[PDB]
Design an enzyme around this catalytic site. Structure first.
Site, PDB file in Angstrom:
ATOM      1  N   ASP A   1       0.967  -1.296   0.041  1.00 42.45           N
ATOM      2  CA  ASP A   1       0.041   0.070  -0.240  1.00 42.45           C
ATOM      3  C   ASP A   1       1.167   1.268  -0.068  1.00 42.45           C
ATOM      4  O   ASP A   1       1.500   1.375   0.814  1.00 42.45           O
ATOM      5  CB  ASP A   1      -0.847   0.000   1.143  1.00 42.45           C
ATOM      6  CG  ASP A   1      -1.875   1.160   1.277  1.00 42.45           C
ATOM      7  OD1 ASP A   1      -2.088   1.771   0.116  1.00 42.45           O
ATOM      8  OD2 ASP A   1      -2.507   1.493   2.187  1.00 42.45           O
TER       9      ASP A   1
ATOM     10  N   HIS B   1      -9.866  -2.533  -7.586  1.00 39.01           N
ATOM     11  CA  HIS B   1      -9.639  -1.253  -6.741  1.00 39.01           C
ATOM     12  C   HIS B   1      -8.823  -0.129  -7.711  1.00 39.01           C
ATOM     13  O   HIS B   1      -9.434   0.963  -7.768  1.00 39.01           O
ATOM     14  CB  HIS B   1      -9.024  -1.591  -5.595  1.00 39.01           C
ATOM     15  CG  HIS B   1      -8.616  -0.175  -4.544  1.00 39.01           C
ATOM     16  ND1 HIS B   1      -9.755   0.158  -4.152  1.00 39.01           N
ATOM     17  CD2 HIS B   1      -7.386   0.181  -4.183  1.00 39.01           C
ATOM     18  CE1 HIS B   1      -9.254   1.047  -3.715  1.00 39.01           C
ATOM     19  NE2 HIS B   1      -8.029   1.201  -3.409  1.00 39.01           N
TER      20      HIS B   1
END
Ligand code: HEM
Ligand code: HEM
Ligand SMILES: [Mg+2]
Ligand SMILES: [Mg+2]
Lengths: 298, 298
Positions: free
Chosen positions: A141, A213
């Site tokens: 991330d 996503h």
């Protein structure tokens, strides 16, 4: 001029405190000055911590404190996807980040002392950077997050006008169901995110689901990306509630909202594939003034 | 007889403790424990800079079954002390993970949960952190007179011979600090409560402090020989919520720990520890940590 917690990169730990105002809104004026002054003192005592912090305000309190001037985009966080993304708008957000959790803890205690019983803490979340900066799902991330102070300022810090040096902040706590995640094959997980898992390489947008996503949040308008500065971190216990505490700063609330409309089905009826293993359980918008504007509160 | 890796390390910055009851057949703990210590070796290999260690330890009932009743002569269920001033929450399984990296601890905790699976019912998971200057959240340095160095810590904590060589007895007790109540006390009053000065951490002479001072309660000698223990305690909690000290000690003799508890909680001389004026224990258990070889022989 910008509050110290927006721009630092690669923090190891953070504390977020979300609170409602119980007392007089004017109590937030002196409290906010005390707190940002405390942050400067802690920075001097712990120079290696790379400490920063942000105080940010919900719509109703900020309208009062600002007399209605500026913060044109600010509003209470609405539900998105008609309720898929809940709304838990509070009055006050404190965000503390650094390389040293123990310093963050002392700063959080300082914040609580400054605001006193004027505030009612709704949650306090301790974020930690996990191995290889991966989300607890196992995916890295941060890769496409704006890098370097120059670009991060461009994305997150308001350039001019009465709000120069400020920023809009969005916070949303997610609860991961890792058992549900682990029932998916790695290729299925990779198509859900839009990047490969171990190697963290982007899957071609033409070759991944539009629900992935990345397809939901890597948004362009006439070729210009709607960028945000993310400060999200994992949180929780291994045996209890755990997930990602999502936090983003942007000079325009617009950029964040467009990503939320996309993720939660409002723009094209399609929802983010991550909802198959994790869900948001809080949500709020806040305005982070410049330091000069805080000092001018009282 | 090799000691488990989590007993001896000094000045760990972070720990996780997992306390759990047995839900299934005690025999499930045999393979699970062997898997876990293998997982610990894997994480030590993957993250050498974490300087990770861990301990798996067992409550009296479980350990009597796993050992066939041989050895661990001092092991017993944790009793209430002080007629309830120290509560008893004896569980079946203790996992203690410590290292320089909370994020590695978190991965090891997840590995523990996967290894034991549904054989256990987690009762609490506590994330400990070293605070500034290794102080307890009360503001007093914690650790000064803890046994120092591998040789001395082995002597105090690690059983030297017999069937249990390489093993250790463990005591864990979670305390909930009332820092508001502490902050009502003058610093001199706090120092007489602890037995050391607060800022400079100088020991107050035993003839100059009340017999209720913490040091007077726990710095115990029998015919001039101190009843030493190896403490691994750390702060835990949030600034706004529950916070305190997660007390953890290792000793080759449970006797040393129990004598200190009888002292602190009023059973020896009718006086109790002055720290009960601002903090209280809310859990308590005794466990036996076998040697690594004994775990392999499960
Ligand atoms: C459970 C919640 C979330 C998880 C686990 C998550 C995880 C990830 C991962 C693994 C990446 C790819 C690596 C990277 O470039 O950082 C990513 C990218 C990104 N995320 Fe999320 N995210 C979450 C929620 C959100 C939300 C709520 C938003 C916006 C409102 C958002 C906006 C973004 C953006 C803008 C990117 C960069 C996309 C690109 O330009 O390639 N994320 N996230
Ligand atoms: C709220 C819980 C506790 C707090 C805040 C606390 C704090 C402290 C402090 C500040 C010291 C002095 C510095 C040091 O030498 O480490 C100390 C020492 C010590 N504590 Fe505690 N402690 C707690 C519970 C306990 C318990 C439950 C035991 C035993 C069962 C214990 C045993 C000891 C021992 C043996 C020493 C060393 C005394 C000496 O030889 O000078 N502590 N503790
Ligand atoms: Mg892109
Ligand atoms: Mg002494």
């Amino acid at each position: 001029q910008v509050q110290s917690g927006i721009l630092p990169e690669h923090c190891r730990a953070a504390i977020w405190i979300e609170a409602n105002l119980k007392g007089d809104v004017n109590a937030l004026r002196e409290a906010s000055k005390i707190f940002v002054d405390n942050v400067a003192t802690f920075q001097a005592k712990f120079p290696d911590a790379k400490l920063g912090a942000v105080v940010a305000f919900g719509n109703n309190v900020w309208r009062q404190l600002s007399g209605g001037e500026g913060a044109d985009e600010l509003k209470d966080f609405p539900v998105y996807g008609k309720g898929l993304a809940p709304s838990t708008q509070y009055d006050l957000l404190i965000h503390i980040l650094s390389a040293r959790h123990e310093v963050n803890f002392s700063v959080a205690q300082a914040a609580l002392a400054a605001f006193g019983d004027a505030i009612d803490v709704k949650e306090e979340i301790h974020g930690f950077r996990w191995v290889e900066e991966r989300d607890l799902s196992g995916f890295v991330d941060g890769t496409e997050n704006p890098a370097g102070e120059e670009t991060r300022r461009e994305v997150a810090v308001i350039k001019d006008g009465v709000d120069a040096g400020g920023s809009y902040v969005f916070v949303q706590r997610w609860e991961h169901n890792l058992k549900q995640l682990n029932r998916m094959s790695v290729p299925d997980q990779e198509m859900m995110i839009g990047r490969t898992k171990d190697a963290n390489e982007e899957i071609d947008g033409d070759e991944r689901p539009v629900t992935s996503h990345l397809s939901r949040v890597d948004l362009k308008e006439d070729g210009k990306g709607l960028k945000i500065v993310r400060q999200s971190l994992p949180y929780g216990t291994a045996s209890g509630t755990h997930g990602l505490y999502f936090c983003a700063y942007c000079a325009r609330l617009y950029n964040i909202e467009q990503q939320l409309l996309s993720m939660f089905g409002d723009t094209d009826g399609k929802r983010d594939a991550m909802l198959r293993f994790t869900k948001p359980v809080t949500g709020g918008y806040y305005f982070a003034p410049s330091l000069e504007r805080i000092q001018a509160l009282g």
